[PDB]
Amino acid sequence: AKATTSVNYAXNLDKRLPELPEGANRAQILESTWSTEFKVYDSFGEAHELQIDFARVPGEVNAWRATVNVDPTNADATATRVGIGTTDGVQNSFIVRFDNNGHLASVTDTAGNVTSPAGQVLVQISYNVVGANPDEAGAPTRHTFDVNLGEIGTSKNTITQFSDKSTTKAYE
Amino acid sequence: DLNIPIGQKLDAKATTSVNYAANLDKRLPELPEGANRAQILESTWSTEFKVYDSFGEAHELQIDFARVPGEVNAWRATVNVDPTNADATATRVGIGTTDGVQNSFIVRFDNNGHLASVTDTAGNVTSPAGQVLVQISYNVVGANPDEAGAPTRHTFDVNLGEIGTSKNTITQFSDKSTTKAYEQDGYTLGYLENFRIDQSGIITGVYSNGVRQEIGQI
């Protein structure tokens, strides 16, 4: 039990998942959304859930929108934003792209800052932790996170997008 | 140190080479030089086998072996990757190239049955002897374009055999029409499942797509 500092993600997303035309309805988005659920800890020692929904962006191949929401039951609160470098000029989504071999290629968040052409890919998560607790935290108070998708150009401990069943999950 | 975890991934290998061989029935009737679509049908034989792109997607490659009209011991092979979407994949099959040729070729048979020669539509013919390789190309629909903007293509060869033999070569012997041999070297994504040791000390890893890679020996 620690401030989780980082969460490594790996495994495969299926290329064959279809797009989301029309702003498709409830049953169609679920047919094209792979989700992953994980458990994490804050500075104090409280247990929170980290959920990331992966779904193909309509109109662009090999590109995925990942929506992150810690404690998804809790709408609006916790804020929850993700953003590579920066973290107030961004929402709770980032768009991950893959290259013609199924290997990780790029991450881009709500703003325009993109990951470097090489090296490990970190995205950073940010939320307000609440749940009463006796002595006060004051102000919005937050908890940055760091999520490790792996390193570009490789499949070792990295997510991949091949035409096989989806397998992406969190580890350590 | 180098670590080899179980459930480690093995990227997909796109097909580069297919080894195909089949026999076309010679006792199929010949085609007069101007037949209709039902008569080319009763003198054609089609088949299908898989190839793999670099995402590990299997594409069904379909070949229709139709008799050349009038001319005998000659068949025409119309090739199509992904036949239900044959127009967008735009297959092209030549000898030595795939630029500026159509998705078809003619294959003439030796008087004994053995593969004589193969000629594309551009005029590119085999050589009189040796193994015959047919270059095949198409659009990988799901691939990102290249640096220039082109829709990216997957290119591989089809080894029909060597001129004048059988066993591992295509034939036109009399009755029986089927596929003999199909060996292609591509495969889909795979995961490391377990290690296996050998009467030698050679430790291999086996993957879920049955690939079997080695590491070293004792």
From TrEMBL, chain A:
The keyword Zinc does not apply. GO terms for biological process: bacterial-type flagellum-dependent swarming motility. It is found in: Bacterial flagellum basal body. Keywords: Bacterial flagellum, Cell projection, Cilium, Flagellum. One of its GO terms (cellular component) is cytosol. The keyword Acetylation does not apply. Its main location: other. Residues 12-172 form the Flagellar hook protein FlgE D2 domain. A flexible structure which links the flagellar filament to the drive apparatus in the basal body. Belongs to the flagella basal body rod proteins family. This is Flagellar hook protein FlgE.
